[PDB]
Amino acid sequence: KYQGMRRHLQVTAPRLFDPEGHPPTHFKSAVMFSSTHPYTLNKLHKCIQSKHVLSTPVSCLPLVPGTTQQCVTYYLLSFVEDKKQAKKLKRVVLAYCEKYHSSVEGTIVKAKPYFPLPE
Amino acid sequence: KKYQGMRRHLQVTAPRLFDPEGHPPTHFKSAVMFSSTHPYTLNKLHKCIQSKHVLSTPVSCLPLVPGTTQQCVTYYLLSFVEDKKQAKKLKRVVLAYCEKYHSSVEGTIVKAKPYFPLPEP
């Protein structure tokens, strides 16, 4: 399921997507991927998983009062070790999506001191 | 309504931040991730940490970290605010309350470059 994207990522970024090896000690960064199409983000939730990248399920952003949004913007977070890895993850995922999922946007995110995942 | 207590607390403690009227900021550059293994508590925070200047997501789950000793899902939500100042304030207020009434809750300052992908008015 999503073999296509999975294999693409494993090839384009073998280290980041090595399903084998050891998680980083802390996840200081992430990429928020957002889109009005939850089905697409769900594809990403399935594909963007490894030892070095952990992704939340798809959820929703809150509506901003005083705008006329016609549609919920969904999102997920993909946690990675640091800023280097986040830049890379965003680059690779979006190169793909640019052709096959243009509804998808990515935003670099950072936590102090790091995201609250166990050690 | 429900959680009237926590709501009133937040608005008295930080009036501008939790003013239910006014104008949202133009961009939300920061947020606080509030997390906990208790989803019911985070549902409370979800209905409560809302205003014109603070917007919170529904409760979701963090992914499990391979090869660790928890076997307990950790839930979270994000509360978006204008910037680092407002995030520091929001975290302080919410956690002063929770420190007494919800010791399971943690707060983490988060920042987005250039800002979080919420629309603009």
Author numbering:
A (entry chain B): 142 to 260
B (entry chain A): 141 to 261
What did the paper state?
LANA mediates persistence of episomal DNA and thus is required for long-term maintenance of viral genomes in dividing cells, a role central to viral latency. The ORF73 from MHV-68 encodes a much smaller, 314 amino acid, 50 kDa nuclear protein (termed mLANA thereafter) which lacks the extensive internal acidic and glutamine-rich repeat region of kLANA. The C-terminal region of mLANA, comprising amino acid residues 140 to 263, has amino acid similarity to the kLANA DNA-binding domain.
The crystallized domain contained residues 140–272, designated mLANA140–272. The tertiary structure of mLANA140–272 exhibits an α+β ferredoxin-like fold which assembles to form a dimeric eight-stranded anti-parallel β-barrel that is central to its functional architecture. Each monomer contributes an anti-parallel 4-stranded β-sheet “half-barrel” from which helix α2 and α3 pack onto the plaited sheet with their axis parallel to the strands of the sheet. Size exclusion analysis confirms that mLANA140–272 is also a dimer in solution. Therefore, we consider the ventral face as the putative DNA binding site of mLANA. The positive electrostatic surface also encompasses the identified 226QAKKLK231 motif that is involved in binding to BET proteins.
